């Protein structure tokens, strides 16, 4: 309740101010009336941010302040890639999907081609978001190699193309989670991990750090999975554990985490990000 | 055919040397079989690597010698995005073909689901390999900056845009202008500029060096209108030959390959700079 | 799962058995036509029949086999009870719903009247099937007892009550697990308790035996609860008082009391009978 | 005709006594204070509480003394069950009443779904109540049988059935009398059954009691037909909206003489001339 209401409060704050230069920022940094329409279509069909939201509570956690004109575009950039992912899984190639969310997919909206580049587009900006500021080239090229690592083909694109190939094999337990780790937990990794970057943690904290980002990201991916399942699915943890086995793993997962943040040297810290496992505590 | 003693030569050395170490380099950076088969059959599909190419003659035009451990990589993940904008080019959803020079295109051989995520990988492991190595990272911010500028909604994605929505459109040639400068012409300017960031080029050598690019580019794309349309292989209204006839066409080659000289001889005369010239005579002005 | 095999199996036989009279029985009882009607539609109405399922496992359990002339009419009255209250929660005056199982209620097909009526009629004609057949008069009137007394004004109708008064208030834990022991949990344990009388069951095994149907029941309350709010009406659930983790915990905490009470019966056949029950929280429905 | 002084006697005596442990009885019985309430304003709104009495008059007419502890609740039960019906008749849903003795129905007191559910309560609490005392479980269970035989989808809720189906149909007085007979006449019926099984009467004496207590139920209904016609659509469906108000009343005085000639089958007492004397409830001048 306290804690889930700290989680609330932080969203309400920070979702309108992350979301508020997105429109302006997507058409100045574009030159096809079109495609910058489809690409800001699908950015702003309402998603709840979590991963730049981890990025800044990270970055609080270690003192450093939001500067928006050096970190909006660096921390957002991890926003237009997720969005990118979103619309290239639901594609005819790929998923087939003609709604989200109760909404049109891009390309029913602008055409199978059109969706293709838009996800092209946002891939792209992106990267020229993440140099686009006023911020040390070291911690600029450190954002850039580790965007593109959690994003590339060992990790975002790996986990699609292994769910390409296994719809009709029932995956054991073990290739699942590495499936996961690449499909989902690379971009939660990397979420915490920006903010360690941009906040110059110390290094005997990055351990800590990013044992509760892999704790988290897999929390995340099980109880979608869950959810998913309940909403209606053999490659998902009911598939493989049943219902009751598969909140069993989701408990022990968050608990994991906690564990993980009793790592960290301050209160403070270990509370701003404990926040986050409330997450799990609501639906969508 | 123009191609002079100087290209050839610079051609035979560089792209087996560019070539040897690609299909290691993305096993080792994938961690799917599939997807990294997907990724190698497209990138060793037989390119003429120009825009590597052009990159590592315009590092040699500074003096500055290529080194792979250093270099490779981000001089070849040019050649990557290359590769994935011709992946996503071929589409069912794009440009629909069967083939590319005669040979299966990646949809065809892996399916359209894999061939999106093999363009995807492709355009990522790009950025990954810029900063790879042990640049300074000013060096690899000023790379990852220049790279998103020239391939993303503002360039080569633009383009590709502007070019789906003129599929049933005659556009002017003031028009056709702006879409070949997004599609091709903004990849050939980064492969110049990204040899005066590596090559660490003096602030009065860029101007010259990017209107011999920005004419390269274009005469590039000019010399492929005219190849579709003099050539069989192995509609044209949105083509130089198209919007100003055959002669027309020839001539508008013929005059940016000079420009492009022209902007060259701004430079001192060097062998390398020669070397760097010599890839205009890719261009056949007398097919036409 | 040889667990979920196990409920499964066990379903598949007896759901069918159980469906096969209720047409025919419920019109040889009526001298409405159009109140059969309406009665039959919302007890064929595709219900997986969890409580008498419960009986028959219980009874069986215990020693006693199902014999059709004498167990059936007692046996599928708490089904026809469980009916009634769907139709009369389904009613206008009550929560007004259009739709259940993707199906219109009663009281859009036959209206909010004779939907009222087909409730009333089910709730006295469970009566009427617990006193049907030729079983000892002291069953019968047990049964009798711990049906009226579970669907009553301290059970069942009390917790349909506390719901009506609760519409737009935020109850606090203690207050909704009484709501909910009344408005669902009663059944659930009459349910094992009906299995205990038809199945004779020594005094000794009855604690065990109920504080597994008690355990039963609140899982099965917590599961609806979590289905629902996963699938202002949210706040008085199990996931509106503890979030979602919370109320998974207690359900899995819950299903951990059912099986500890179950290890208190003397035999493994009785244990793992009752046991594969928990497995219906493992699948989603 | 004037009331019986024995029938006078005999209310005197009962109806408070069994109106006494009602409301405690009511509250003990629930877990809910608006339920409780509801119900029980309901129960104690004033009425004649003909049909407990009709059991008692039959227990005592067989020599059986009552005892409250082990016969109150189950004689009771049927009050409960009667006024669950009253309650339900005058819902929304069904005859839309907002008023009862010209004072509120319970669901404009309570609110429809209250009421609704008061009913529910009222009907599963008279089974609880018929076996909450220390009887016989034979006798229990022959009273069980028959309250929800003379209650449910054959007798009273098949009548109120045909009757909200009847509700602008001019109704054939033969369907009239099964509307009856199911509505109004199964409960009156199962008030002397349940004497009889209290009562434990020989099985050669169920005919007669069982006849006395089938004119008993028609009688009730004429006459009430003939009060809701003498003072202040629905009249439509009623003996003298069929008969008219003379054809009505000679229906009432041959039926009341049809149930005394019924029990004059049985061997003369005291306590069956109090049981007969029930006949002096209708008043056969009233038409007059």
């Known amino acids: 309740s306290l804690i889930n209401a700290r989680l609330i409060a932080f969203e309400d704050q920070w979702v309108p101010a992350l979301n508020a230069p997105l429109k302006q920022a997507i058409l100045a940094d574009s030159q096809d009336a079109q495609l910058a329409a489809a690409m800001t279509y699908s950015v702003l069909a309402g998603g709840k941010?979590?991963?730049?939201?981890?990025?800044?509570?990270?970055?609080?956690?270690?003192?450093?302040?939001?500067?928006?004109?050096?970190?909006?575009?660096?921390?957002?950039?991890?926003?237009?890639?997720?969005?990118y992912s979103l619309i290239h899984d639901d594609l005819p190639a790929m998923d087939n999907d003609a709604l989200r969310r109760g909404e049109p997919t891009n390309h029913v909206k602008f055409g199978a081609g059109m969706a293709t580049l838009a996800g092209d587009g946002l891939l792209t900006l992106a990267f020229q978001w993440l140099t686009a500021t006023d911020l040390p080239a070291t911690m600029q090229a450190a954002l850039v190699q580790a965007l593109a690592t959690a994003a590339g083909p060992s990790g975002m694109v790996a986990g699609q193309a292994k769910d390409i190939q296994s719809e009709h094999v029932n995956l054991p337990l073990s290739q699942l989670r590495v499936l996961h780790k690449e499909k989902t937990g690379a971009l939660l990794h990397y979420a915490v991990q920006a903010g360690l970057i941009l906040g110059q943690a110390p290094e005997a904290q990055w351990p800590a750090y990013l044992q509760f980002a892999d704790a988290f990201g897999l929390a995340f991916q099980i109880y979608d999975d869950i959810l998913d399942v309940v909403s209606s699915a053999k490659n998902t943890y009911p598939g493989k554990l049943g219902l009751i086995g598969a909140n069993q793993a989701l408990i022990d997962t968050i608990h994991s985490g906690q564990a993980?943040?009793?790592?960290?040297?301050?209160?403070?810290?270990?509370?701003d990000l404990a926040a986050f496992f409330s997450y799990f505590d609501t639906e969508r």
């Open 49 to 83: 941010r979590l991963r730049p939201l981890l990025t800044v509570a990270t970055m609080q956690s270690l003192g450093v302040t939001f500067v928006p004109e050096r970190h909006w575009r660096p921390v957002m950039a991890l926003e237009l890639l997720h969005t």
């Open 260 to 271: 993980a943040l009793q790592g960290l040297p301050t209160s403070t810290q270990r509370d």
